[PDB]
Amino acid sequence: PNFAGTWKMRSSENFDELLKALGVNAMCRKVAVAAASKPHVEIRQDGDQFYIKTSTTVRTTEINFKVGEGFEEETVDGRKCRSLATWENENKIHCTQTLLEGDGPKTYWTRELANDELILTFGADDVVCTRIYVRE
Amino acid sequence: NFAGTWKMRSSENFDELLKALGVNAMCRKVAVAAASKPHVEIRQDGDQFYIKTSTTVRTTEINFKVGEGFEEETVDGRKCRSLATWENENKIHCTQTLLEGDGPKTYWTRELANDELILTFGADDVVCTRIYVRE
């Protein structure tokens, strides 16, 4: 059971389309595609408490949060937001994001276990990027 | 003479410079990595310069004569008019003037020192330094 373990991305869908929906410029988008191709995720779960390490070739980001408690993070394009995760059900976290400064697209992420795969989705207005992870 | 083939030996404050230029975190991470291993070809004939800079998925070919305006982009890709002048016999200073919008004052310099090529970028108070050696 559980979200915890080491994950390798098996597939990604609609990354470029999501970034365009976020108002990321063409040059950054074009380049950013290659670099994000093969991320490794380490997740620690203790009930509603999470530590998530996301490693690329270029960078590691580490965040902690609790399901049920407001916290702070960045959007996929690195803009500051307040976040709130709840369990949609036993195997799925939905996390709403609200920008701290100004206006921009409505963003969210979700994480889901299905068939012992981790399905990460990012939303930006009507667009949805889907990243599918398997245990390594 | 600046002419020849150059590889980067070291880079300092690139991330800090991009932050000064209002580049957000994801694009910063990307830009630094992509710029991590540039290959530079310079041809120099007196005041006339060609600078070819090759990164992962970008080549810029920059032509200018010392004393005449030319078009280029800022390090973060905003439209500018540029002007190169000799600060001294081994240093080009290049003033940049933004065409579209308002933003930080930007410049670059290139300098020969102990047969190394030293590229400097400014964005208001921040300074990025990249050091090239002949490859």
Ligand SMILES: CC1(C)CCC(C)(C)c2nc(C#Cc3ccc(C(=O)O)cc3)cnc21
């Ligand atoms: C607009 C944004 C964020 C996104 C697009 C890319 C192309 C990733 C980008 N690249 C740079 C750079 C550079 C650079 C500096 C110096 C040298 C050198 O001559 O050593 C080469 C490349 C900046 N910003 C971006």
